[PDB]
């Protein structure tokens, strides 16, 4: 209980999500808010006017402060800056109304801030930074190539969606915040464990960001499991959302199973991998609680 405080997740209406996941909130949240502010200022300086919220949420906690509550305080500002640029660039990648001329116009500014992120990370922790650069580029490239694929099942969708939502990229940021690197063997084995975590994160995002993504569908590619379920099963919004809610609960339980299965088969586990597992579980609770009222998805929490 050094970088963060335990928060009782049962004080929030999580719609049955998050059972058996503990919630923590970083004590240095101000540093995350600072990173978000600076990234937003840099976006206006080099790219254009801001159109939306990113990770800030002063009520339930800045995204980085609740998703990555074990971050070293000296790394939290940079991580929040990187994620804020990712939140804003994400909407650019999904956009459909950008003229070719505007796309060309933004490119060098987006490149400047991308490279600024990578260079600052590399100067801080070269090993950890290389994993962030690799996963970020994979997320950007996969979104760009595959965002209009017509998926015919949630299972197929999720193999794209875990990359499109940047789950491996956030994992690489989390490791950076811990000052942690994994061996090639740990990487191989932990990938199996964290797959259901990535699915739960992506589907939870879909659940809480659906309304906003429909509001934007006139200018933005719709990438959302609730819509897939509506189409495949001919269901309305609340019924499809219930299916997605049940599916999140399935993946949440699966991740807890795989953590304990790893301990039972490949254990006693090191303190390092123990902290890795715990840190991954905090992404689930933090993502969930942040999404309930973040201004990005919830219009009556917006200002400015
Ligand atoms: C909602 C935030 N994010 C990453 C920036 C996409 C914009 C998806 C994500 C959520 C939680 C964990 C990992 C990825
Ligand atoms: Mg996206
Ligand atoms: Mg998006
Ligand atoms: Mg979304
Ligand atoms: Na969209």
Author numbering: 5 to 308
Authors' text:
Here, we describe the discovery that class I terpene cyclases are bifunctional, in that they catalyze both terpene cyclization and aromatic prenyltransferase reactions in the same active site. Class I terpene cyclases require 3 Mg2+ ions for catalytic function, and these metal ions are coordinated by conserved metal-binding motifs in a unique α-helical protein fold. Interestingly, the diterpene synthase FgGS can accept GPP as substrate donor to produce long-chain prenylindoles 11–14. This characterization implies that the active site cavity of FgGS is sufficiently large to allow the binding of indole as well as C5 DMAPP or C10 GPP to produce prenylindoles.
Even so, metal coordination interactions are as expected: the side chain of D94 coordinates to Mg2+A and Mg2+C with syn–syn bidentate geometry, and Oδ2 of E98 coordinates to Mg2+A and Mg2+C with monodentate bridging geometry. Interestingly, Oδ1 of E98 coordinates to a Na+ ion outside of the enclosed active site cavity. The BTAC cation binds in the lower cavity and its positively charged quaternary amino group engages in cation-π interactions with F67, F91, and W294. Additionally, in the upper active site cavity there are two ordered waters (W21 and W22) and an ethylene glycol molecule (monomer A), or five ordered water molecules (W93, W101, W126, W222, and W263) and an ethylene glycol molecule (monomer B). The binding of the bulky BTAC molecule reveals that there is more than enough volume to accommodate the small 5-carbon prenyl group of DMAPP in the active site pocket.
